[PDB]
Ligand binder design. Structure first.
Ligand SMILES: CN(C)c1cccc2c(S(=O)(=O)N[C@@H](CCC(=O)O)C(=O)O)cccc12
Ligand SMILES: CN(C)c1cccc2c(S(=O)(=O)N[C@@H](CCC(=O)O)C(=O)O)cccc12
Ligand SMILES: CCCCCCCCCCCCCC(=O)O
Ligand SMILES: CCCCCCCCCCCCCC(=O)O
Ligand SMILES: CCCCCCCCCCCCCC(=O)O
Ligand SMILES: CCCCCCCCCCCCCC(=O)O
Ligand SMILES: CCCCCCCCCCCCCC(=O)O
Ligand SMILES: CCCCCCCCCCCCCC(=O)O
Length: 582
């Protein structure tokens, strides 16, 4: 009301409040030490209570932006530590706030955060639970200035649970380790998706984004009217735009609003929202944004009615092209929760091309009457890839399936560095085990989501070290053409084999003491190196060496004087294998 701080405090609660203030400050003063921030939090929090007691007390009427800005400029070593950023304090709001966003280094030069030993972590945890988690919250926040604060807080709590459960466990490590890994990946995923979306909104512009939204929102809320979906798409676009700009507050307020709105009108939006709309302010958004797709209406007409048969297609279309196409998407999206958003985009795109040609011809209806037929091969491509791939994965295991992928892509883009090929293939495989476990009706949406980050990661670390033009075409192609572009890659006939290296195929017994994740990655690296040396090798040939090798390993890791073995058979293997592969 008359005091923003007081208000947020009352809403959030002391705990959440102090956690967010901490995260907020860690995202700007990325260089200040943890103790420094904690003091700021306390000073701000104390101030907050002052205003809760008397909404009219000093400065309590100031805006969060101003309050935050002033506290920020309070840091003495500001100009010494951040230099140019200190010049932000001369400017008045909102230039001051704006000035800060511009100096929020999206990727500082901080040391990789190392994972301590389970025991040391559990003891730290148990001894001083609060500072143990805050301290790490701080470490993550400063390294990820754009990670939406509240989501970060959401993660912290999942971590807390893991430590509370696991540190009591018999085998602490067997309980904790796996959870920490599932949280990391999930965190990397949220990070990549966020930057991805913002990146998209940047290059491709609003339209394409709204297009994406209509499709996603329709699949999720098939019972809502198109007018409700357009309303939501509009607000969601403002939200992502603002949130991408990096301003936490503005971003948060838009998010709360849209959640409030959706809840009040939840009856005309989705039935699956009850649960989500009860939750606390800080958790509404998160919940809603992930809510399962609602059951789609049973009495739903054939699309062909309003989009192929009708004699007013072009009329309705010229009247408002995008609204029409949007309606197409809305209609097609909600009848297919099983389609990937991007696949729906391809149809809509295809439909649009057709209408553009057809509506400027003798008689439209004749020209576009069989367009749905143009869809068939489009829908099928992603489906046959999924079946063909999940099948292979069912036979072979995650690991063996990854090797298949390894051989397949190395042949496609031999120029790519071996360590890059190994990672991509591994991640690709994970997507394989994570999605194939799903009923065929949810597979495609699943692949889209995991595959989207993986391909982006692939593109980013190639943007940097350009190795192939073909990978660059795919990486800079339409966001809806990206995946098919890669699927279209064919064996590289131009590639010239890599001169043989003895050092690259010699193994030591240390391959026995190494952990699974390490043995595999050590074997897989040799595999990519093998293919990069003899690309003309048939699956049979390769399957031979791999079999020979596999034994070699086990065999040499189950006999005395290991080192002797690996060097003795080593000569033999390399020798025999080289001849088999001409
Ligand atoms: C849940 N989420 C906030 C996260 C938790 C733990 C680690 C996270 C990381 S991370 O550990 O820094 N992940 C590193 C790679 C792995 C490493 O070097 O340790 C990174 O890509 O930046 C990134 C993004 C989100 C994370
Ligand atoms: C709570 N509300 C304000 C929302 C915030 C952010 C995303 C939202 C979405 S969404 O973008 O379609 N849901 C996203 C996941 C959430 C995210 O990445 O932010 C998706 O399926 O790709 C739907 C409804 C409400 C949303
Ligand atoms: C997300 C905020 C909660 C902070 C608690 C993190 C505790 C785990 C410490 C290890 C993190 C390093 C990343 C990793 O390798 O797992
Ligand atoms: C609410 C109306 C906004 C939706 C506009 C419909 C756009 C459909 C065209 C699909 C093109 C995808 C963009 C792209 O080429 O990347
Ligand atoms: C001066 C410090 C300001 C403290 C930061 C308060 C902003 C956090 C509000 C969180 C609201 C939840 C929004 C959402 O649902 O995403
Ligand atoms: C590896 C798992 C198989 C994934 C098959 C690719 C299908 C991608 C669906 C996304 C899209 O519509 O392009
Ligand atoms: C560099 C490696 C290329 C990455 C290709 C990933 C595309 C996954 C779809 C599967 C396929 O069609 O091959
Ligand atoms: C021309 C020298 C070729 C000999 C080197 C063979 C090494 C290839 C990697 C084998 C890994 C197979 C995967 C596995 O069985 O786990």
């Amino acid at each position: 009301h008359k005091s923003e701080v007081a208000h947020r405090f009352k809403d959030l609660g002391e705990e959440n409040f102090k956690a967010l203030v901490l995260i907020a400050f860690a995202q700007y003063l990325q260089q200040c030490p943890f103790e420094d921030h904690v003091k700021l939090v306390n000073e701000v929090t104390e101030f907050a209570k002052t205003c809760v007691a008397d909404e009219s007390a000093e400065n309590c009427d100031k805006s969060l932006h101003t309050l935050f800005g002033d506290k920020l400029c309070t840091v003495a070593t500001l100009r010494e530590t951040y230099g140019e950023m200190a010049d932000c304090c001369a400017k008045q709001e909102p230039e001051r706030n704006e000035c800060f966003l511009q100096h929020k280094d999206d990727n500082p030069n901080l040391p990789r955060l190392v994972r301590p030993e389970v025991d040391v972590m559990c003891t730290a945890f148990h001894d001083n639970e609060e500072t143990f988690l805050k301290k790490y919250l701080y470490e993550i926040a400063r390294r990820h200035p754009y990670f939406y604060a509240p989501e970060l807080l959401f993660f912290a709590k999942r971590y807390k649970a893991a430590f509370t459960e696991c540190c009591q466990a018999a085998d602490k490590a067997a309980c904790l380790l796996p959870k920490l890994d599932e949280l990391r990946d999930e965190g990397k995923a949220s990070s990549a998706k966020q930057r991805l979306k913002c990146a998209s909104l940047q290059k491709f512009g609003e339209r394409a984004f709204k297009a994406w939204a209509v499709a996603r929102l329709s699949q999720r809320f098939p019972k809502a009217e198109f007018a409700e979906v357009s309303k939501l798409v509009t607000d969601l676009t403002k939200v992502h735009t603002e949130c991408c700009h990096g301003d936490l507050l503005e971003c948060a307020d838009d998010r709360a609003d849209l959640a409030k709105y959706i809840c009040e009108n939840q009856d005309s939006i989705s039935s699956k929202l009850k649960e989500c709309c009860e939750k606390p302010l800080l958790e509404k958004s998160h919940c809603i944004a992930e809510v399962e797709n609602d059951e789609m209406p049973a009495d739903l007409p054939s699309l062909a009615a309003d989009f192929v048969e009708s004699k007013d297609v072009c009329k309705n279309y010229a009247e408002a092209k995008d609204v029409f196409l949007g309606m197409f998407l809305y209609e097609y999206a909600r009848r297919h929760p099983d389609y990937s958003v991007v696949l729906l985009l391809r149809l809509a795109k295809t439909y649009e091309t057709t209408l553009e040609k057809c509506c400027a011809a003798a008689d439209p209806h004749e020209c576009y009457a069989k367009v749905f037929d143009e869809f068939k091969p489009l829908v099928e491509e992603p489906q046959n890839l999924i079946k063909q791939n999940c099948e292979l994965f069912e036979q072979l295991g995650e690991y063996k399936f990854q090797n298949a992928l390894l051989v397949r892509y190395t042949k496609k883009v031999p120029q790519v560095s071996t360590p890059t090929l190994v990672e991509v293939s591994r991640n690709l495989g994970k997507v394989g085990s994570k999605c194939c476990k799903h009923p065929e009706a949810k597979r495609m949406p699943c692949a889209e989501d995991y595959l989207s980050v993986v391909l982006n990661q692939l593109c980013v670390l190639h943007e940097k070290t350009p190795v192939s033009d073909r990978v660059t075409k795919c990486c800079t192609e339409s966001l809806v053409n990206r995946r098919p572009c890669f699927s279209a890659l064919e064996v590289d006939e131009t590639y010239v084999p890599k001169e043989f290296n003895a050092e690259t195929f010699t193994f030591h017994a240390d391959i026995c003491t190494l952990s699974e994740k390490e043995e595999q990655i050590k074997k897989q690296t040799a595999l990519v190196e093998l293919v990069k040396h003899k690309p003309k090798a048939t699956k049979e040939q390769l399957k031979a060496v791999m079999d020979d090798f596999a034994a070699f390993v086990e065999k040499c890791c189950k006999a005395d004087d290991k080192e002797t073995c690996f060097a003795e058979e080593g000569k033999k293997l390399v020798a025999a294998s080289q001849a088999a592969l001409g």
